[PDB]
Design a binder for this molecule. Structure first.
Ligand code: SF4
Ligand code: SF4
Ligand code: FES
Ligand code: FES
Ligand SMILES: [Mg+2]
Ligand SMILES: [Zn+2]
Lengths: 115, 208, 125, 48, 96, 86, 109, 690, 77
């Protein structure tokens, strides 16, 4: 029951199919992105980052949430392909000027009060 | 009551009440409520499934003729199970009138795009999607319109913080503009202004 | 057409909040206490959701109050505690709820000020 | 001002200064408040 | 009422001067420190106390609508003077 | 290696703690008479389950469920932990 | 017009808590007779007459007289201060041997 | 039943007989404007702001005093009611001074708000205003008498709640004034509350003067640690600094009041603060260092010693999280010498039964008793809100109070049975008339202060009081849930420590002098270096430089109660949690985080990494410590009485004398209050007249 | 008071840029007309609603009257 209306997919199988299609499109786009934006990363780095972004949301079990995630990923792909994005936008995925924040207890205790 | 109080208009109030009754009788499938505000502003609450029929009837009917869409926006009310309130404002030039149509949705439920009924909605629905995250089904070209490229989240939502989560600055080592977690030299100072004494008895709620 | 989704509601991956501000945060759901400097009770009608206080420091220039907490100002208003709990749950925030405290009904009696044999009699008026 | 002189006050500047930006006489902002938290001062004598 | 700290820095009306070990003094090297020289506490301390032949006096700071809100000062205590809470002027009844 | 403390978390009005309650009503007194130096902390429990806790040297602990135990079962378990067994 | 009399007390060498005041033995007999009229447990009701009695022996009411009445009746001193400052026949300052009071209300005016 | 039906604006409601019009309007959720009515004071009826129209009645009635009559129809928004409110506001504002920009009441003024909501927007007053001279009633309450609207709330509070008759009205009519008529200091442990109840800026806080406005403040709802009552408070902050402390209404505990130490000792949080870790240099002087160095030194000393050598003393302001963390850390080195500065008898049941060391009746219960016996304690200074509850019962329920101890002034009349502890035995045997008094009492209550327990004969005193309770129980039977036995605590950390298995008292330290000592906020001066061997390693953790700091080898700066989310258990056994208002200053850290980091450095890492995990461990040890605001407990008085009958320690001849003999002693008691300049001013004011 | 002034509304014929330019020029002329009327018809009186719970009072009233000061304070905070 729970009486919900879908966006595109009726169960997780169709949602997974759409996820795979979007992943294929991003995988094909990465080399062109590296060429056009004149990025100093490799194609391997770009595809690894695409996989990491996809795996960030691997725990989702709602087909509607997956449909919205695919819609957002398609929005980002359309944005990248048309060059609406600049090199700064593409490089924002890699956080190159962010100092690594530690995760163990002792370093956090040393730096400050935040957990 | 004369010099400083806004005058009333009962004729327009009666006309709008009668027309609201008219609209409700013609479309019982979707119309849930009809209201006439004290300053003569007709409001019609409907079911989401009736977004396209209602508007179509309102813009096409001989006695309606609301051929112009002033604006279309959304309101976020987190306490409601259906978070978002979709508000259409329509103007009739033939009858020199205005009408407001309201419906509801939540985060995961699409609303039918009304680009077919009104061409003006295109950018309005894109803006609602960008600011609030409300998806519109069958929209020609749905994408962000106001926010920056790659911006995460929807700013107009009540939960979103006023200054957001990231800022921008130019970094010389990478020779480009970078986005970093927001740090503020001076924090925005939250004021508590609400008076502990009630202002308007006419709006008092039952004590539950 | 309806698809009968079976799972609990969860929208964290769509809100765009950085994960640090989803997992390490604690919200408080409460009806705010009446300000003891006044007698009005109109600010004790609705439920509030607010986040935990984070570090504030002193700006080296001008000595202003600096923060790095983006949720340090966010306050949400709800009709009932159930709505607040549902919002916090669907947004993925750990919460602490406090039951609403109401003043107990008190038996007032002006004439008690002038009791024949009781301790309640006023020594002044 | 020759026919309508301004009112005289003893705190009004007797010598006008121009825009002193980009000059060793420029304004430099600073906090005008005093220290908020005082720290404990350990005793100067040995404890044993 | 200006006066310098042991470091040679002027002390403001507020009383704040950077401490000897405070690095922030570096912001004044090759520049100056802005200090207003007309101390209000000293200037108001020079005004003569006004003698009035009534128990309650009124003050509006002078200038009518150009001063402060008008207030009424009781002058029954003879051990002290009535001080305006806006302007700082002092009033007393003719005593002794 | 040895006992340092005992903790008995019993729930005030749940049926599954009833027998444990009887123990404290009758058999706790003489058990404290026999063990004047052993801290037997009697504490109140939330709707989950009754429990007994034993602490050993260098902070080693493990617990035993007392759900639906009768008073004799409770004192048998307590003498088992109090003796060089289990 | 305005009253003129102050309703605060400031100690003076002639009017302080150590100003000598005490009832005469005859006045103590009268105080006992006054106290008896009221119901037991309601002894304060004698604040109004006994205070007056003090003024009838001393001429006026020094702060020590108010303290003595408060201690005799076991009433908090601030209650006696309230009574003394409320009623206009109580003299909290010395008066002349003869107190001339001329009426100036409308029928008399 | 006995309910009568009345109508508020044509709407039916059922009310109890004798209910005032104001309360009936409140039943439907309408608030009648007021200035002089306070639901915790006696009705006055003087302000006249509450006047309302009753249908078919020509005269408006005062809603705060008039009892509703059956079939009445209140009309709270009629023209008559509105015009009454407008006229009364006009008369109130006629003589009021134009002081809002300089008044501390500015954004929090009931007069301002009700003028905006119910009054007119204009003045037609064309005369001069009255002005009155200021009164000086001490260093805590600033007085600006011109602002007074003559509500008389201060007079009713002082007379009825505080128990003092210093305030009053002198003169009459327009010239009537509120004051003391003489130079007197209104000094009492509940005095500051007259600032809260005064609706105008006539009575304001002197320490708080001019510092902040209400709209800029951030409100953090928290708990007080200045005593064992656990009063609910609001900490108001602005830009990372604590502005002031306000009461928060809790019906069960402190109502809407707080003691003066709870209200005015917060400035001590800004003085003598430990901000950085410190170690002893080569010359034996304390010098700043990093966290890593200090933790490494402490961990080295911890690794070498174990068992009986390692010991810890907990102070008065420690929280349950830090206590359990320290307990686990010392257990990992096989140490059980974890003690408190406050002594509780360990004989018989001891800490074994929660009922034995708690105020079983509770604060709320005092309202249901008719006889109370207090032994060796001063309720007024050890627990001012508890004494306020006792006076409330004494005033409204004719509660009879008797005391065994020095004849301290409790602000209400009681029966002084004496100060000899042997009298307790005389009551227990039955030769005293008070034995008969307790025999016939339906809800007898016996309260023993923890302060009395500090002396050497305390185990005997507890046995005698338990004997009195047992005699009452066997003679009258058990009525049900009454719990005659009660223990009154004065230290915030004591009940949680006892709940955690900590051994009360410092006796085990003297029995087994340790080599490594952990002073966890312990500033009582109980254990000095004369009571310890040489080369003893003393580690102090806390937020203030006090008795315990300058005698230590390593100093670890901790967080005060305003800078952490920590759990405290009051005298009732109720568990409450504080919230972070501001972060700890400098390099100071959360106490349990200090202990956990130290455990990691020494190799025996504690299982918990977050606050929820440490509270899960807290639940594992004592489950009642995570049930915030729950006070239900099981009575085990019979078992504890049996276990107490074993030993027969002899009673001392020394008369029962409390530590807080007089008001001056009340102010400076703990490290936060000892660092407060406001408390120093209060002490100077109560010792020196001026 | 737009119902009390007289002006014409320019109307185009072709819907192009040229027609929109002519409309704006004529609109400028009609605004001159309306301004002329407004100049000749300005009445006397106060400038804000005589309701101090909405509009701030005058400064002289704010410095003389208690209600005016209270309303100034509350309206500006
Ligand atoms: S008490 Fe209220 S009305 Fe009076 S001056 Fe202060 S803020 Fe203004
Ligand atoms: S000082 Fe405050 S509480 Fe006391 S009478 Fe005046 S207004 Fe009322
Ligand atoms: S006696 Fe003079 S007016 Fe009455
Ligand atoms: S509130 Fe009723 S007269 Fe004051
Ligand atoms: Mg006040
Ligand atoms: Zn002035």
């Amino acid at each position: 029951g729970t009486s919900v209306k879908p966006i595109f997919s009726r169960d997780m199988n169709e949602a997974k199919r759409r996820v795979r299609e979007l992943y294929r499109a991003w995988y094909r786009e990465v080399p062109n992105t590296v060429h056009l934006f004149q990025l100093d990363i490799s194609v391997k780095q770009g595809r690894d980052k695409v996989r990491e972004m996809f795996m960030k949301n691997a725990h989702v079990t709602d087909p509607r949430v997956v449909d919205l995630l695919v819609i957002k990923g398609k929005m980002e792909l359309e944005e990248t392909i048309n060059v609406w994005k600049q090199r700064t936008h593409i490089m924002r995925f890699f956080h190159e000027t962010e100092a690594p924040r530690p995760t163990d207890f002792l370093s956090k205790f040393y730096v400050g009060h935040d957990p | 009551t004369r010099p400083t109080i806004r005058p009333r208009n009962d004729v327009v109030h009666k006309q709008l009440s009668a027309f609201g009754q008219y609209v409700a009788e013609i479309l019982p499938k979707y119309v849930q409520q009809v209201q006439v505000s004290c300053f003569n502003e007709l409001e019609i609450f409907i079911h989401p499934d009736g977004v396209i029929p209602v508007l179509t009837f309102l813009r096409d009917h001989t006695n309606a003729q609301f051929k112009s869409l002033a604006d279309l926006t959304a309101v976020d009310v987190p306490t409601r199970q259906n978070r978002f309130e979709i508000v259409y404002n329509l103007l009739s030039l033939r009858f020199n009138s205005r009408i407001r149509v309201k419906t509801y949705t939540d985060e995961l439920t699409p609303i039918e795009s009304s680009v077919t009924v009104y061409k003006a909605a295109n950018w309005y629905e894109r803006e609602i999607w960008d600011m609030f995250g409300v998806f519109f089904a069958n929209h020609p070209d749905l994408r962000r319109i106001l926010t920056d490229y790659g911006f995460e989240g929807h700013p107009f939502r009540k939960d979103f913080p006023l200054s957001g989560y990231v800022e921008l600055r130019y970094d010389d080592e990478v020779k480009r503009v970078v986005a970093e977690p927001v740090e503020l030299a001076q924090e925005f100072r939250k004021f508590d202004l609400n008076s502990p004494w009630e202002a308007f008895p006419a709006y008092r709620q039952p004590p539950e | 057409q309806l698809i009968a989704v079976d799972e609990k509601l969860d929208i964290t991956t769509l809100t765009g909040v950085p994960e640090e501000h989803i997992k390490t945060r604690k919200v408080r759901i409460f009806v705010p206490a009446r300000n003891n400097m006044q007698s009005g009770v109109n600010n004790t009608k609705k439920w509030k959701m607010e986040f935990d206080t984070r570090e504030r420091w002193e700006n080296p220039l001008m000595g202003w109050s600096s923060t790095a907490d983006p949720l340090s100002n966010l306050v949400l208003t709800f009709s009932t505690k159930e709505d607040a709990v549902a919002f916090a749950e669907k947004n993925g925030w750990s919460f602490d709820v406090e039951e609403r405290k109401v003043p107990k009904p008190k038996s007032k009696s002006y004439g008690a000020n002038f009791s024949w044999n009781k301790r309640t009699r006023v020594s002044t008026k | 001002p020759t026919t309508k002189p301004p009112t005289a006050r003893k705190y009004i500047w007797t010598n006008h200064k121009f825009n002193v930006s980009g000059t060793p006489q420029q304004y430099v902002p600073y906090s005008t408040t005093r220290k908020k938290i005082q720290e404990w001062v350990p005793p100067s004598t040995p404890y044993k | 009422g200006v006066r310098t700290s042991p470091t040679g820095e002027k002390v403001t009306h507020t009383g704040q001067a950077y401490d000897d070990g405070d690095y922030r003094r570096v912001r004044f090297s090759d520049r100056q420190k802005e200090v207003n020289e007309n101390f209000a506490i000293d200037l108001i301390a020079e005004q003569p106390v006004s003698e009035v032949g009534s128990r309650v006096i009124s003050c509006d700071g002078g200038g009518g609508a150009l001063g402060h809100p008008r207030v009424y000062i009781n002058l029954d205590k003879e051990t002290k003077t009535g001080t305006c809470g806006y302007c700082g002027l002092q009033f007393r009844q003719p005593h002794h | 290696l040895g006992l340092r403390e005992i903790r008995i978390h019993l729930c005030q009005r749940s049926p599954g703690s009833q027998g444990v309650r009887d123990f404290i009503e009758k058999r706790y007194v003489e058990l404290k008479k026999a063990n004047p130096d052993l801290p037997i902390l009697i504490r109140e429990c939330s709707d989950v389950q009754p429990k007994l806790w034993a602490r050993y040297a260098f902070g080693q602990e493990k617990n035993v469920s007392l759900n639906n135990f009768s008073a004799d079962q409770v004192t048998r378990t307590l003498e088992n932990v109090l003796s060089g067994k289990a | 017009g305005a009253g003129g009399a102050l309703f605060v007390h400031r100690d003076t060498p002639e009017n302080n808590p150590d100003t000598p005041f005490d009832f005469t033995p005859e006045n103590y007999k009268r105080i006992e007779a006054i106290v008896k009229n009221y119901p037991e447990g309601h002894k304060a009701a004698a604040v109004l007459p006994v205070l007056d009695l003090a003024q009838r022996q001393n001429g006026w009411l020094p702060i020590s007289a108010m303290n003595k009445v408060a201690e005799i009746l076991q009433v908090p001193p601030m209650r006696v201060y309230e009574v003394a400052t409320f009623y206009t026949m109580y003299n909290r300052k010395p008066v002349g041997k003869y107190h001339i009071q001329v009426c100036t209300t409308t029928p008399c005016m | 039943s006995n309910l009568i039906e009345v109508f508020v604006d044509g709407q039916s409601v059922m009310v109890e007989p004798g209910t005032t019009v104001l309360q009936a309007c409140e039943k439907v959720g309408m608030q009648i404007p007021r200035f002089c009515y306070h639901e915790r004071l006696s009705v006055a009826g003087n302000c006249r702001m509450c006047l309302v129209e009753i249908e078919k009645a020509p005269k408006v009635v005062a809603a705060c005093a008039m009892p509703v009559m059956k079939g009445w129809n209140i009309l709270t928004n009629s023209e008559k009611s509105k015009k009454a409110r407008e006229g009364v506001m006009e008369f109130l504002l006629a003589n009021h001074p134009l002081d809002c920009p300089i008044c501390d009441q500015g954004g929090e003024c009931d007069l301002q708000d009700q003028s905006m909501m119910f009054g007119s927007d204009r003045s037609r007053f064309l005369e001069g205003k009255r002005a009155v001279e200021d009164k000086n009633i001490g260093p805590l309450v600033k007085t600006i008498m011109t602002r007074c609207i003559q509500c008389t709330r201060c007079i009713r509070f002082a007379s009825e709640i505080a128990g003092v008759d210093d305030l009053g009205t002198t003169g009459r009519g327009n010239d009537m004034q509120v004051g003391t008529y003489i130079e007197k200091m209104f000094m009492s442990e509940l005095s500051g509350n007259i600032i809260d109840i005064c609706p105008v800026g006539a009575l304001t806080s002197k320490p708080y003067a001019f510092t902040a406005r209400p709209w800029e403040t951030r409100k953090t709802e928290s708990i007080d640690v200045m005593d064992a009552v656990g009063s609910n408070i609001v900490v108001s902050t602005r830009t990372g600094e604590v502005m002031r402390i306000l009461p928060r209404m809790h019906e069960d505990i402190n109502e809407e009041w707080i003691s003066d130490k709870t209200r005015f000792a917060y400035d001590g949080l800004k003085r003598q603060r430990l901000t950085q870790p410190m170690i002893r240099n080569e010359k034996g002087l304390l010098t700043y260092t990093t966290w890593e160095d200090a933790l490494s030194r402490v961990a080295g000393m911890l690794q070498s010693f174990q068992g009986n050598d390692v010991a810890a003393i907990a102070g008065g302001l420690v929280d349950a999280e830090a206590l359990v963390a320290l307990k686990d850390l010392l257990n990992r080195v096989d140490s059980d010498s974890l003690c408190t500065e406050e002594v509780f008898p360990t004989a018989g049941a001891g800490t074994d039964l929660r009922s034995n060391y708690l105020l079983n009746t509770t604060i709320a219960g005092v309202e249901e008793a008719d006889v109370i016996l207090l032994v060796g304690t001063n309720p007024r200074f050890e627990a001012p809100l508890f004494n306020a509850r006792i006076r409330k019962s004494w005033l409204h329920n004719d509660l009879k109070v008797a005391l065994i101890g020095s004849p301290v002034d409790l602000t209400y009349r009681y029966d002084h049975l004496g100060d000899s502890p042997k009298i307790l035995q005389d009551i227990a045997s039955g030769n005293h008339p008070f034995s008969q008094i307790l025999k016939e009492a339906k809800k007898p209550m016996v309260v023993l202060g923890s302060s009395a327990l500090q002396r050497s004969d305390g185990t005997a005193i507890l046995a005698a009081v338990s004997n009195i309770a047992q005699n009452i129980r066997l003679s009258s039977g058990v009525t049900g849930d009454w719990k005659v036995m009660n223990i009154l605590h004065r230290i915030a950390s004591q009940v949680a420590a006892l709940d955690l298995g900590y051994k009360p008292g410092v006796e085990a330290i003297r029995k087994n002098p340790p080599k490594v000592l952990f002073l966890l906020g312990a500033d009582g001066g109980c254990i000095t270096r004369q009571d310890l061997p040489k080369d003893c390693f003393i580690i102090y953790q806390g937020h203030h430089g006090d008795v315990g700091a300058p005698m230590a080898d390593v100093i670890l700066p901790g967080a005060a109660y305003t800078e952490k989310s920590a759990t405290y258990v009051n005298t009732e056994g109720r568990a409450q949690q504080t919230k972070v208002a501001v972060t700890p200053p400098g390099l100071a850290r959360e106490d349990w985080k200090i202990i956990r980091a130290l455990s990691e450095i020494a190799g025996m890492t504690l299982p918990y990494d977050t606050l929820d995990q440490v509270r899960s461990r807290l639940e594992e040890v004592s489950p009642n410590l995570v049930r915030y605001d729950d006070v239900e407990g099981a009575n085990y008085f019979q078992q504890a009485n049996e276990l107490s009958k074993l030993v027969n320690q002899q009673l001392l001849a020394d008369p029962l004398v409390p530590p807080q003999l007089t008001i001056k002693d009340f102010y400076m008691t703990d490290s936060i209050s000892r660092a407060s300049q406001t408390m120093a001013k209060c002490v100077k004011a109560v010792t020196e007249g001026i | 008071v737009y119902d009390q002034v007289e002006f014409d509304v320019p109307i185009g014929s072709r819907g192009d840029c040229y027609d929109r330019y002519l409309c704006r020029v004529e609109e400028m002329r009609q605004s001159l007309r309306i301004i002329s009327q407004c100049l000749n018809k300005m009445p006397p009186g106060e400038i804000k609603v005589d309701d101090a719970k909405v509009s701030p009072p005058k400064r002289a009233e704010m410095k003389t009257s208690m209600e005016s000061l209270i309303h100034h304070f509350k309206l500006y905070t």
